[PDB]
Amino acid sequence: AYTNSFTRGVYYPDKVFRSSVLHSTQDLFLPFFSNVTWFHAIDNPVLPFNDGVYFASTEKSNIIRGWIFGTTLDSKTQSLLIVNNATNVVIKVCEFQFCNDPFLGVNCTFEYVSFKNLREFVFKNIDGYFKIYSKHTPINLVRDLPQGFSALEPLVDLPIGINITRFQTLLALHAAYYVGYLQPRTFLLKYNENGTITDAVDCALDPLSET
Amino acid sequence: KCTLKSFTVEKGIYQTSNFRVQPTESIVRFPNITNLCPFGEVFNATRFASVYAWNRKRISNCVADYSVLYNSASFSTFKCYGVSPTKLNDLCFTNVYADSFVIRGDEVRQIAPGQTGKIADYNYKLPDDFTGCVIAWNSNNLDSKVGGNYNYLFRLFRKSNLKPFERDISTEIYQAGSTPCNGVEGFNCYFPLQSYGFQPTNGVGYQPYRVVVLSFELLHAPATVCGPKKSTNLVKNKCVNFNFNGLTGTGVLTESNKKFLPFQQFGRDIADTTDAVRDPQTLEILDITPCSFGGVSVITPGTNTSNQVAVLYQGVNCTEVNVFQTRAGCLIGAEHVNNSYECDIPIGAGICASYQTSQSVIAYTMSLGAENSVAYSNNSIAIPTNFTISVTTEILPVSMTKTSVDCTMYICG
Amino acid sequence: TMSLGAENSVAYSNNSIAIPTNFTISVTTEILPVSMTKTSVDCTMYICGDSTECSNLLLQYGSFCTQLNRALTGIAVEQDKNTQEVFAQVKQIYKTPPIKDFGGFNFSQILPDPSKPSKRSFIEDLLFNKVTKFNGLTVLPPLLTDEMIAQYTSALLAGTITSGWTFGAGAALQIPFAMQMAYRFNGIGVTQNVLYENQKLIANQFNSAIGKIQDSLSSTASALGKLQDVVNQNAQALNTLVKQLSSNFGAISSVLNDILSRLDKVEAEVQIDRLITGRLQSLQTYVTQQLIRAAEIRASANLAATKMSECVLGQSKRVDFCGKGYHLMSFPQSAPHGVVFLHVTYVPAQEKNFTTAPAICHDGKAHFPREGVFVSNGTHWFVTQRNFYEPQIITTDNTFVSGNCDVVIGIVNNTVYDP
Amino acid sequence: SALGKLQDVVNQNAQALNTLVKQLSSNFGAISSVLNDILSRLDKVEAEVQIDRLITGRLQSLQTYVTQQLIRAAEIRASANLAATKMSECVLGQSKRVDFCGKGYHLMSFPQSAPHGVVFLHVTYVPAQEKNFTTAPAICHDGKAHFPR
């Protein structure tokens, strides 16, 4: 199934404070009103990755708990495994081996450790760095990806050098989730008095946005 | 007098140099990390990579000394890009990476930005805007052997050239023509690697050299590598020169209300110039205004009448510099007066200044003219009983000097 | 496809005339820019940001820096002169009488409000509502404050209302306001009994026309677009000059302290000279376009200073110079960076057609009107003033004789009365 | 100081030429401001790199001068168009335009020549000695209202 992305999938572009200003930047973004793919775990196939991925999932009951990323997933090369399950974050980057159907049962160069609601995440792999941004909010709409804006904040940057073309999400076994590819796009971003990114324009969306 | 390049100054108000005060101290700030960086594990390792399979070491959580590196007797070549080697001990980096391999002494020329040839194109490619240092040394005593050391290899063939920092260790037989190679050499089927086979009898260009490429992550993200230099105490509300994490400048450091998000490390102006910092040793958001400043204007009657002068600090409040707060800025050396006159020297916002008595520079609000009430009523008229013939002079510019220039004689003489 | 206007056929013939039987007093606004924001740049603090390393390289370019500061200072001094030449056209600060006995005309919307901290008029308060740094750039205040400009528009207006044009040419001579308006009516070629016989109508039309100025300025936000365009262009130019500091111009960084903290002297000077080159070209572009923009503001201020003398201090015979229609009078109001003129004009309003003749025949003599036209209702002949229908008996004393009946094309036979 | 508008035209054009000459002493980043010094110290391939810094800066110096002379010529043309209008309307006529031919009611004007300019001697009538009177818009006679011609 599919849904319209609306104004979703925007993040803080660099670790610099700016305020009371409009700022123009070019990066991998989810284009406004782009064609998002939609799933119901309540349904976790392997999917392509391309240049980068926006991922989001709904929440009330903690069904979707992590992700796997790589190319072949057969220990012949490195892969990324992320757990994020509200009680724990655990991340490792080994030459992993897996089955075709991984779940949480009811050479590792690096490690990191730490509906009612909506969870948003962005994953991109640039110049040998794999980078993570996220945002979390209450919602009313059970049906679909809700129309609105809020910028994703950087969590983690990994200098890990892994080549990636595919990914998958992880379930607890013996929620709804959304996927959309980023594209190289120019955005105009609004920084308020506190340096919150409060609004954005996709400069390639239509002639008025270009204006 | 110097700003006008003249020993005589006519009556008026003149803008001179902007108001600044010399830096009180050269402040230094760095994260107080204690570990010496593991560069001995980079440069003095017994094993070393074949250049087709170059080995990267991440360097982080530590203090370096690049002067100890670039002054070391160990190195036969040392070059840097985007930074100069003399300056490295004053900097910090989000990360450093050391990429390491063996090649013959002639081929070291291929380890530079934008290079071409077997090593640059099939083994290890730098980007055009590489920031870092390339370091190399003759390793004949370690890496040559009698009858040849064949353990060191380079990629002889590839279907396409490498992208910057691309890595490729495959040994599949290279198909140089129509022949399907299927895991064996033959007519236009060749093994994709070759060896220098290093021997101690070789001329220096055919002797082994070890290479290290230090790549510097000189980003705005918080530093994990820094040079050996030590932090000073901090200063506030006084003009100072500074270094934070390698960022130099001069200004009045202050506290600030700028509510940085947890990941933000620097703040920038509309000009992209740094206007604020988070201190690396504690989470303090300073503002980096320059020295407390404005333009300085000097009010003078002509030097043909007095050497007395008044000074206007444009937009500066008198607490930040007789003394008088005009809306144009703080005015100093002018006697403020409650009379009003025609404007003599204009200051701005209704204020003017003149030289008056015992003589002094005075400052006053300008008079618009004499006040009058016309004696109006709905049945009174005034009619003139006499007249005066007036002759008055109007002067108009009509032309200017007709200049001509031989631009070839002006430029090239 | 754009429409140029409604098509119209004038009812022309060799003996038909249209004469207006009534009039309207029109008040129309004109808005003129007079000044622009005065700016200073310290070209060394813009280019080099108090780096001494950059400052010593900038000395190798010589007097480019001081001649940019000199050009901006000349522009800044001109803005005060532009303002002085529009508003300081009164030698004395005239004030209005305590009793406003102006023959029914009401100036209270355009005269000062004494309650306000600056004593602007009600309409000047509407105008002042409808029009809205570390890098070596500064904005300098004007010499005359808005309260000083408002005291000049007050004195120009008080002189006009109490003394006619006389304060423009000598001492202010008082005259009753309805008698001053009777002179304005003679000045447009309307006989002054037309004012005194219609004074309540003329006063009501004026008071109503000033009421429409309030309603337009209170609602039509786009009205002062000429003055807002001047504010916008100067903000756009400074915002462009500041953002050009973020450019590389081919250097390794736009941040001059990156170059100085990354590189040693001989390598740094090659990168700093690229920034000096591009930042000096950036600043030369700003100062050149501000010199060209100042020349347009000066042309507009010279026009505004000419409309002050010829429309406010006088009555103008120049067509369209002081609004559409025959000019009676004008009032200045101050606005941000500008002046507003309220131009009062007589517009003829209710035509009737009449038969006409160039001359009249009586006793074989050809008679011509002294100060009028000959006109007929279809049975009788009258002489009329040319700008307002007021018919009179054709008489030896409102006509003059020249030659006989034989020479004039279109002459008509009619008796001329002898008193 | 009456002639200040004409002396200002002389002073600005002198200052512009002196600024243009002083810029020949600038290095613009070359080893020297002097072109024979570069050519007597450096051989061809080295000399051309130094000369191109002087050409670049001297050419920019000369373009800056011509641009400010073009802007200054436009102001002199505006002033000469005004002086030509004053000649027609104030010398060859009598002007009804307020303050165009001096203050007071214009009678007459005379031109005098000056360096780079013109001087107009404007002759005007100024009313001088008021008296106050009672006034009326009209008068009643035989029930007829009379107005002054």
Ligand SMILES: *[C@@H]1O[C@H](CO)[C@@H](O)[C@H](O)[C@H]1NC(C)=O
């Ligand atoms: C998304 O693309 C598919 C075809 O690949 C199409 O069926 C679907 O209607 C599209 N959705 C939207 C919202 O355009």
Ligand SMILES: *[C@@H]1O[C@H](CO)[C@@H](O)[C@H](O)[C@H]1NC(C)=O
């Ligand atoms: C979260 O993951 C950890 C393993 O990293 C596991 O011990 C824990 O039980 C998990 N909690 C939930 C709520 O799945």
Ligand SMILES: *[C@@H]1O[C@H](CO)[C@@H](O)[C@H](O)[C@H]1NC(C)=O
């Ligand atoms: C580590 O590398 C070797 C090859 O050198 C590989 O066989 C092994 O599978 C890797 N380790 C893991 C955890 O897969």
Ligand SMILES: *[C@@H]1O[C@H](CO)[C@@H](O)[C@H](O)[C@H]1NC(C)=O
């Ligand atoms: C800035 O943030 C503070 C709380 O941190 C809040 O009180 C204030 O309203 C915010 N300002 C704006 C304009 O959102």
Ligand SMILES: *[C@@H]1O[C@H](CO)[C@@H](O)[C@H](O)[C@H]1NC(C)=O
């Ligand atoms: C390093 O700085 C921390 C504060 O961030 C302080 O607690 C600690 O004592 C310091 N240690 C040294 C050796 O300076």
Ligand SMILES: *[C@@H]1O[C@H](CO)[C@@H](O)[C@H](O)[C@H]1NC(C)=O
């Ligand atoms: C110089 O100033 C004096 C007064 O200090 C004055 O008398 C004299 O005229 C001035 N010089 C000239 C050349 O006018």
Ligand SMILES: *[C@@H]1O[C@H](CO)[C@@H](O)[C@H](O)[C@H]1NC(C)=O
């Ligand atoms: C100048 O600064 C002082 C505080 O140092 C303040 O009390 C005063 O009001 C300021 N004056 C102006 C005109 O801003």
Ligand SMILES: *[C@@H]1O[C@H](CO)[C@@H](O)[C@H](O)[C@H]1NC(C)=O
């Ligand atoms: C000037 O006026 C101020 C009040 O505006 C008053 O305090 C001061 O004493 C006066 N000084 C003189 C010399 O009149």
Ligand SMILES: *[C@@H]1O[C@H](CO)[C@@H](O)[C@H](O)[C@H]1NC(C)=O
């Ligand atoms: C005058 O008469 C003509 C007759 O054709 C008519 O067209 C025109 O509209 C009339 N004008 C007025 C002012 O009555």
Ligand SMILES: *[C@@H]1O[C@H](CO)[C@@H](O)[C@H](O)[C@H]1NC(C)=O
């Ligand atoms: C006006 O035109 C008529 C025809 O329409 C002609 O008979 C008459 O002689 C003309 N009279 C004048 C005054 O030209």
Ligand SMILES: *[C@@H]1O[C@H](CO)[C@@H](O)[C@H](O)[C@H]1NC(C)=O
């Ligand atoms: C005219 O009369 C008024 C009466 O208030 C008086 O103020 C004024 O001085 C008189 N002017 C002349 C010229 O006599």
